[PDB]
Amino acid sequence: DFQAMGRIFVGLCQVGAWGCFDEFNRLEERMLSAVSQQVQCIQEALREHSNPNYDKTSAPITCELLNKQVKVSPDMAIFITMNPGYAGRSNLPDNLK
Amino acid sequence: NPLLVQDVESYDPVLNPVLNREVRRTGGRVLITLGDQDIDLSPSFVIFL
Amino acid sequence: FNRYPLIIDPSGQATEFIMNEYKDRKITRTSFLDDAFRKNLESALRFGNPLLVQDVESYDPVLNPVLNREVRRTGGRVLITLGDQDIDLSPSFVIFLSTRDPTVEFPPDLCSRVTFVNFTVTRSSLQSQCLNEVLKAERPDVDEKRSDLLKLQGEFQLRLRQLEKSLLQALNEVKGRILDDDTIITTLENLKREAAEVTRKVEETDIVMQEVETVSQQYLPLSTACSSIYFTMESLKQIHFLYQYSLQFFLDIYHNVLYENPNLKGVTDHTQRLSIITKDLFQVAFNRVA
Amino acid sequence: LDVPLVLFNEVLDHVLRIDRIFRQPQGHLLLIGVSGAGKTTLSRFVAWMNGLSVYQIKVHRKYTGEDFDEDLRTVLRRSGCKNEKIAFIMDESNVLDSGFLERMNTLLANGEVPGLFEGDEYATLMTQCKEGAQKEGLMLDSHEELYKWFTSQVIRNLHVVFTMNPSSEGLKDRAATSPALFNRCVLNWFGDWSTEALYQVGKEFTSKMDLEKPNYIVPDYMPVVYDKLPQPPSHREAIVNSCVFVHQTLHQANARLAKRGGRTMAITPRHYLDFINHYANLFHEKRSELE
Amino acid sequence: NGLSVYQIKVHRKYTGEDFDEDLRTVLRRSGCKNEKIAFIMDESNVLD
Amino acid sequence: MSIMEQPLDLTHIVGTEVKPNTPVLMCSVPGYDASGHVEDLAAEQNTQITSIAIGSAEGFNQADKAINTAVKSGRWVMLKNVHLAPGWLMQLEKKLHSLQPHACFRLFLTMEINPKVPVNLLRAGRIFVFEPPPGVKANMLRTFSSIPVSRICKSPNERARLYFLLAWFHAIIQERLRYAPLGWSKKYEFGESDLRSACDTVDTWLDDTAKGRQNISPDKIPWSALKTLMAQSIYGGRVDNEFDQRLLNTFLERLFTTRSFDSEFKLACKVDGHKDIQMPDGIRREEFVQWVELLPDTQTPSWLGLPNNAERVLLTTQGVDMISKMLKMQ
Amino acid sequence: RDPKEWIPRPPEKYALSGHRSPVTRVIFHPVFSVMVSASEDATIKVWDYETGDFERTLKGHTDSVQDISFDHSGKLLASCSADMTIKLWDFQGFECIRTMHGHDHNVSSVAIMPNGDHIVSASRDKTIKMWEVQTGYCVKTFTGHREWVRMVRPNQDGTLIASCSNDQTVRVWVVATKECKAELREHEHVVECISWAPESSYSSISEATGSETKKSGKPGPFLLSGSRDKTIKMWDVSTGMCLMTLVGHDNWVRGVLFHSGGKFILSCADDKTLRVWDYKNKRCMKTLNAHEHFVTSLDFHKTAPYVVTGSVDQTVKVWECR
Amino acid sequence: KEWIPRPPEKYALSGHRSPVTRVIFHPVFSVMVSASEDATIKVWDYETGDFERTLKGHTDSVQDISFDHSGKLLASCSADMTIKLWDFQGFECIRTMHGHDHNVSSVAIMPNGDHIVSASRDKTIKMWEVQTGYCVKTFTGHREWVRMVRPNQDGTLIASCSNDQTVRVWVVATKECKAELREHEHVVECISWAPESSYSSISEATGSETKKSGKPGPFLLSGSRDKTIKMWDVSTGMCLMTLVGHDNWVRGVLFHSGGKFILSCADDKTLRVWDYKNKRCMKTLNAHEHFVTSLDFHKTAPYVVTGSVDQTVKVWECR
Numbered sequence A: 001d002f003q004a005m006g007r008i009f010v011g012l013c014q015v016g017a018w019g020c021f022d023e024f025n026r027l028e029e030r031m032l033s034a035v036s037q038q039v040q041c042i043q044e045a046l047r048e049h050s051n052p053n054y055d056k057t058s059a060p061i062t063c064e065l066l067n068k069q070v071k072v073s074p075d076m077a078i079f080i081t082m083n084p085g086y087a088g089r090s091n092l093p094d095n096l097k
Numbered sequence B: 001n002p003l004l005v006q007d008v009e010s011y012d013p014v015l016n017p018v019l020n021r022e023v024r025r026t027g028g029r030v031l032i033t034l035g036d037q038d039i040d041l042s043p044s045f046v047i048f049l
Numbered sequence C: 001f002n003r004y005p006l007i008i009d010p011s012g013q014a015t016e017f018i019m020n021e022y023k024d025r026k027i028t029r030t031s032f033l034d035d036a037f038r039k040n041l042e043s044a045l046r047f048g049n050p051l052l053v054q055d056v057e058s059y060d061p062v063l064n065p066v067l068n069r070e071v072r073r074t075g076g077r078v079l080i081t082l083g084d085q086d087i088d089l090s091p092s093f094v095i096f097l098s099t100r101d102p103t104v105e106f107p108p109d110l111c112s113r114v115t116f117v118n119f120t121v122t123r124s125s126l127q128s129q130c131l132n133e134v135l136k137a138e139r140p141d142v143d144e145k146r147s148d149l150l151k152l153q154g155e156f157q158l159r160l161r162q163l164e165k166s167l168l169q170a171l172n173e174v175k176g177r178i179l180d181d182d183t184i185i186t187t188l189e190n191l192k193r194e195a196a197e198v199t200r201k202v203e204e205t206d207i208v209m210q211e212v213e214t215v216s217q218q219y220l221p222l223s224t225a226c227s228s229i230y231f232t233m234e235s236l237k238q239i240h241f242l243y244q245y246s247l248q249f250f251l252d253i254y255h256n257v258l259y260e261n262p263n264l265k266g267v268t269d270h271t272q273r274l275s276i277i278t279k280d281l282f283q284v285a286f287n288r289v290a
Numbered sequence D: 001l002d003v004p005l006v007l008f009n010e011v012l013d014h015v016l017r018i019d020r021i022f023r024q025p026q027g028h029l030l031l032i033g034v035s036g037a038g039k040t041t042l043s044r045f046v047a048w049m050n051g052l053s054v055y056q057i058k059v060h061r062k063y064t065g066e067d068f069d070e071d072l073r074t075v076l077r078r079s080g081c082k083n084e085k086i087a088f089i090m091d092e093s094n095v096l097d098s099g100f101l102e103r104m105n106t107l108l109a110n111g112e113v114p115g116l117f118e119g120d121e122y123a124t125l126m127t128q129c130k131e132g133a134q135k136e137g138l139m140l141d142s143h144e145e146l147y148k149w150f151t152s153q154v155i156r157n158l159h160v161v162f163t164m165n166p167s168s169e170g171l172k173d174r175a176a177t178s179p180a181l182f183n184r185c186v187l188n189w190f191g192d193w194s195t196e197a198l199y200q201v202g203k204e205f206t207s208k209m210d211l212e213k214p215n216y217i218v219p220d221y222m223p224v225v226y227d228k229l230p231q232p233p234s235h236r237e238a239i240v241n242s243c244v245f246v247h248q249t250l251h252q253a254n255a256r257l258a259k260r261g262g263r264t265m266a267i268t269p270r271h272y273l274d275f276i277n278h279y280a281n282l283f284h285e286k287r288s289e290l291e
Numbered sequence E: 001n002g003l004s005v006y007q008i009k010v011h012r013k014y015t016g017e018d019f020d021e022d023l024r025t026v027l028r029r030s031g032c033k034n035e036k037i038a039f040i041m042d043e044s045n046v047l048d
Numbered sequence F: 001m002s003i004m005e006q007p008l009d010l011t012h013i014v015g016t017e018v019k020p021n022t023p024v025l026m027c028s029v030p031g032y033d034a035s036g037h038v039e040d041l042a043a044e045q046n047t048q049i050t051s052i053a054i055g056s057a058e059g060f061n062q063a064d065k066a067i068n069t070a071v072k073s074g075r076w077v078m079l080k081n082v083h084l085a086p087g088w089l090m091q092l093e094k095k096l097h098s099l100q101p102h103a104c105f106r107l108f109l110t111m112e113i114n115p116k117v118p119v120n121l122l123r124a125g126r127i128f129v130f131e132p133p134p135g136v137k138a139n140m141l142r143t144f145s146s147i148p149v150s151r152i153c154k155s156p157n158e159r160a161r162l163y164f165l166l167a168w169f170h171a172i173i174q175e176r177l178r179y180a181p182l183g184w185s186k187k188y189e190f191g192e193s194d195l196r197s198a199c200d201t202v203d204t205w206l207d208d209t210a211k212g213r214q215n216i217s218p219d220k221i222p223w224s225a226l227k228t229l230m231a232q233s234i235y236g237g238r239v240d241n242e243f244d245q246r247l248l249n250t251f252l253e254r255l256f257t258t259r260s261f262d263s264e265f266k267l268a269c270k271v272d273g274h275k276d277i278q279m280p281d282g283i284r285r286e287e288f289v290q291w292v293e294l295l296p297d298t299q300t301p302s303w304l305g306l307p308n309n310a311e312r313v314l315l316t317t318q319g320v321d322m323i324s325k326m327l328k329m330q
Numbered sequence G: 001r002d003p004k005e006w007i008p009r010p011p012e013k014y015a016l017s018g019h020r021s022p023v024t025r026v027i028f029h030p031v032f033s034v035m036v037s038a039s040e041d042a043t044i045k046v047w048d049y050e051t052g053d054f055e056r057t058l059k060g061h062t063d064s065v066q067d068i069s070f071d072h073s074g075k076l077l078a079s080c081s082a083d084m085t086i087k088l089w090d091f092q093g094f095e096c097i098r099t100m101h102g103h104d105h106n107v108s109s110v111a112i113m114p115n116g117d118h119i120v121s122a123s124r125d126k127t128i129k130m131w132e133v134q135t136g137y138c139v140k141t142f143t144g145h146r147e148w149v150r151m152v153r154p155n156q157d158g159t160l161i162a163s164c165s166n167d168q169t170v171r172v173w174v175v176a177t178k179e180c181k182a183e184l185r186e187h188e189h190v191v192e193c194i195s196w197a198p199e200s201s202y203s204s205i206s207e208a209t210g211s212e213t214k215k216s217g218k219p220g221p222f223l224l225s226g227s228r229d230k231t232i233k234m235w236d237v238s239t240g241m242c243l244m245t246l247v248g249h250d251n252w253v254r255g256v257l258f259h260s261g262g263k264f265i266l267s268c269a270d271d272k273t274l275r276v277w278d279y280k281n282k283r284c285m286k287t288l289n290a291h292e293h294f295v296t297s298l299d300f301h302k303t304a305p306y307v308v309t310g311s312v313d314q315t316v317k318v319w320e321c322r
Numbered sequence H: 001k002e003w004i005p006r007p008p009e010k011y012a013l014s015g016h017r018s019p020v021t022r023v024i025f026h027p028v029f030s031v032m033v034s035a036s037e038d039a040t041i042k043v044w045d046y047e048t049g050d051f052e053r054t055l056k057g058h059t060d061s062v063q064d065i066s067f068d069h070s071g072k073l074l075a076s077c078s079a080d081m082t083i084k085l086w087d088f089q090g091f092e093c094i095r096t097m098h099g100h101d102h103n104v105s106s107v108a109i110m111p112n113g114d115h116i117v118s119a120s121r122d123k124t125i126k127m128w129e130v131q132t133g134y135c136v137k138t139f140t141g142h143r144e145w146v147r148m149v150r151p152n153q154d155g156t157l158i159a160s161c162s163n164d165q166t167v168r169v170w171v172v173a174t175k176e177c178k179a180e181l182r183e184h185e186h187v188v189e190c191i192s193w194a195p196e197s198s199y200s201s202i203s204e205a206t207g208s209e210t211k212k213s214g215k216p217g218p219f220l221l222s223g224s225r226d227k228t229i230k231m232w233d234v235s236t237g238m239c240l241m242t243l244v245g246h247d248n249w250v251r252g253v254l255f256h257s258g259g260k261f262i263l264s265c266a267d268d269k270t271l272r273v274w275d276y277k278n279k280r281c282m283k284t285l286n287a288h289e290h291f292v293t294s295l296d297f298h299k300t301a302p303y304v305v306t307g308s309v310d311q312t313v314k315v316w317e318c319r
């Protein structure tokens, strides 16, 4: 659900690990829509980390995950592996795709 | 509904709050605690033994 | 009504009509979505207050004895068993149920328990509304003249009815013969002279109403086109579920084409303005709907 | 209950049928017919006749399965422990969940719900059952035969009445979702009010109205609606026939409107009752004003 | 003083078992729930 | 009907024609979203917008709190994928009716065209349908309107030509989807994300090659890099058929070459049998936009490389459907 | 006048007397320099505390008004009365815009949540209810108190509400999910009044009670509870522990609150005195012979140096702080 | 303060079945009290014009009513020869002091709040005790019907106006008429003294010279049926200024709370506000369709009430 995926995202952001989510379309459509927000926040935090004007001596890059400020390591990434040909699997919302 | 109750020699000790007028006002005007039920007392009530 | 009405007015005009009719009786507007609906219902039942309840698609089955009139009369009281507690039903109590959804489905028991009053938009009423709106927009003096004329006609007809009723009452209440008392003759003469004056006023208001009508005949085709356009828009739901358009949508289109029309900036001729208004009405209706 | 009722032949037949079931052990009813036909009123009246106490669950928006379980516990405690004859009138609109149907199925068939009472509730039930068995003159100590006596008391005392509208697909689905609803319940098809019933109601209600026209001319082609209408009808009979025709016209109107694709509202006998009440009131008011 | 007044509601059917139940209620409230209770009872309430 | 061919002007409609009490329902066919349009609109108007993705209970809580804050503070609120909560949509419609919001408050409800969306909500708000643009010309117009002017007009003067070529390629590829078995093998999700990725790739590689110089040689443009990336990752990523990949490679090698900078380059060949589409000679955004706006109204599948008869059965079916629709509301 | 150290002084500024019945509560307008006082004569009189002149009476309640509160903007006034109703007042036009029924008995408290979109009220039917400001619908019902709930107060951010009852306990609820966060039962009598600690007092409370700095940096919300056992207790809502007990009142404590600077505690009781507490040393600094009868309520202005106390002698007094 | 009544009204209270005789303001509460000729005293809420209650203990027409400093007691006089003292907390008559032969015209509680004065047709003014109810000392010297009686601000000086054209100021301690004024053209009906807020305003209004003590001295005023309003010096007994212009007999006079303007009623069916320091304000304001009987000025609120023979009490806004 939203809470479990958010906690996993917090762990991956803090560790700096790659998150491969296989069979990502087995989530409910509403849960995929909700998770899109956290994915977008993490991606924006990563993007604002990559600008040249950022300096490591300044405050570290953080993102709002589960109503908390979580440091986002530059090494993390989100990968989703899906089989779209299986009938009954959820359809990812356009904002998530 | 004025009430007349006969055979007072077998008085039932439940009228004691009613006979003593042990009521409190507000929150429903006159409130009487008949046993465990917070009955609302009607001003037109009268009982004869 | 015998069964308590269930009003269906998407525009909300019936709701305000009900609130205005029962304002003097202290009508309370509540809803089924309120957690305190039971308390308001019991207060209305006990004290006999008119009640208007919205969101009837969330109907509370606690109203079943009230709608069914399952009363028990004992000791001169009228007992209604609202749930688990008995309430003395005041005879002045009345409840109106309302909803803004014309497409809501009701279970058959609720359909049996209420009188359905449906406030739909007719072609004639829409034509009248559009004609009045264009008259106010283009000829405001004529619009206020027509409003004053309607008020005067209503007052004059009420006065005529009162005078006729008073004349009948005076002729019926005599304790003897008319010429026995002079006051009866005084009253009859006063009533007749008032009736004559009001009839003259009615005639002059009638001729000025005739001129008001004959100046408004030019805008009738625009109102007919407006009614046709709206009832085409309303039927767009037959080819797709997404083409749901309310009356306020068309009314906003009309307001935009009347008052917010760039093509009326420097045009003063009435016929030219009317032609521009019609053309831009069609154009704006297509642009907004499509 | 202070609601007037107009009695016709079908009402007497139905009250007799209902009275037959209430006098039998484990006698449950399944009344099927249009809403407003008097199923609940007739059931309450007959329960009053037989000494049964009418119980109805007070469903609302926030009603859930636990509230239904508590209501079932109350009904079972009253019926079995207190040896009370209870008519449990329950409507299809009271079924907010399939768990309701599961509990109803188990209660209708077996006479008890095995898991309804547990923990403190089970202990209280056992104490009340021991008191009731002492009252009845039985000496029961262990929980097994106490529960058996409670089940027998519930079977002998509790009567369940089900009222629902005649939906074909709904009936087919209920034939499988609640199998005991069709095996442990006597099915009475009340249906809609017939043409004869409508005519009798119109004749009885409008009896006080004058409706007398000695110079009424019978038309050559009489629009007969009620089959048993007398061949030389009077003015009153023609009026009641016209009322029945009005009701049937509304039925055909809804049929045609639904055929095209519009949204229709069900026409019930309450519509006919409102029609005749309005007719009487309007007749009286217009006659008085004209006089 | 903040005490909760408790009075037994006697009647014609009030027997020893009802009095024992009232005692159990009062003792539960005042010993398990830490509630200060003023148990007021009259000599007429002593039916046995 | 000429207004319908132009890109939707959300700024004017939102500013003037939409009351704060009316939600802005933006229904979109699958493969399209209106979230980006509203975020761009809020960015250009310097208006704060709260975007919430519907689907969680705490999501509903944040939606309620954001609406309550915005109706007083006059900010904008986005609720995306609201078609996944129809009952909460009915509750929201009931909430919106009894409300007196700030003059600048706007509520945007982003859903797809779903039959489960409540009818009362559809009547309450103003609906905007987002779908594939009707033709090639409209598709290029939308592409040019979406891309900021300052983004195209950068230091290299050849960036505008590359952007026009990319817009033409996107329009040709996306219009071929209307002919499902002929244009492609299946309905691919060629959309704004692919166009944005391609634009970013063009910018990155042009900046890497042209080190800020005002002009670059046509042969010095990294044609191979753009072609390979757009055939392997950006547009060819969704392609899972070898022949669809072959068609995409054919289009890329026909369009993205140094010959595209010639004055006599042909975008399409023999569209009506005699005439053919011609490469504009302009070097700035405005010239290309004017050329797009000067495109003929008449469009045939030969613009896409398809045979002219590829649309005959579809047009006949659409005509019959129009007749049926007219006869269904008489 | 140190901007966070003034305390009220014995010589009163004004003694406003227009009420015909004991003054229940007194509050300050957050924005304007005007004052509102509720009394038992079903009237809500409005006073100016700079010049001490009566302005207007807000009537419409049938029975005694028990509580009044302002929203953050000061544009709405919510009042609850003994007639089981809650009225919302448009303080610009001074008309009652909405009346809310639903409580089964005397409604003895009312509070507008900090966001300003909901109204929380406590009543004698042992329940706490939440009302939408816009629609007036009851949306939540906090049950669990065993007796008449006397007060309800939301915290600074509105995520928590505290309540006190005749059941001698103080309960802290969670607004979002209705759960009872804590049950503070250490008073030996009925709890009359409660008050939340401002963020300006968190450090002072922490260093006065000796509480070590938590790793979070948030000491945890602090609460007060005046009760009829003549004591004031400071609680830690996060842990549920009573940080200190303030002894010195001679009768039932009726109102309690912090100095806006978070350095002292102001409380009033039925001993006819208004006391200033130095909770640093857990002792009372100043005692004011406020009124000639029971003192029912007090308020302390957020910015201006003014204290107001209502009383059963039907008099509202304004105190200059120096 | 420049509070001045305006021609528009807010409420015209009409519950009395007989002409209203006097209207007063409660010292502290938002309560207005009207005594009428139907032997009843009615209580009104002048802020919203709502009838509150009636005190129907009197036998004959009630003439004059008066509160004390605390407003907890209400003293009333009537034509039934009695003085009734009302407990305003419970609104029940608590003490009915008898005597004082024939119709009693006026009543007043001096600020000390323990004794009452009263005037009547029997050509004397009596002195009662609130606590006990015995008339301890009786004032004699008026040869005719005494109409109105008014004490000072500290319970030491008393003035009484009568039909005998004399306005005699009396002393509590010595019971001697130290100032006797007989100079009016016709019957003197109403009197009202000067608040300390206006003592300074009389110096430049008249030009009087301060004595060795420097105080201007207690001040007087007496309205009369001769359509003339005259203000008098209690210390000396000489005239300051005569206010002329009333059409009919004047029935009530009192000073503005700010001590700047003169505001009075009369039988001319109109209310007239007069300035005396500069003779600038001469506003004439009709109030009732019939004779106007009495009036009062709120100490702090911007309200004035008037009672009239038309059985109606009206409240005017001060602006």
Ligand SMILES: Nc1ncnc2c1ncn2[C@@H]1O[C@H](COP(=O)(O)OP(=O)(O)O)[C@@H](O)[C@H]1O
Binding pocket: C068, C069, C109, D003, D004, D005, D006, D007, D011, D034, D035, D036, D037, D038, D039, D040, D041, D042, D163, D270, D273
């Ligand atoms: N025979 C009858 N005569 C007159 N009214 C009837 C009759 N039967 C039912 N009603 C009306 O129907 C109402 C009750 O209907 P009810 O029995 O609850 O319907 P259902 O059978 O759907 O439960 C009553 O208010 C009553 O007025």
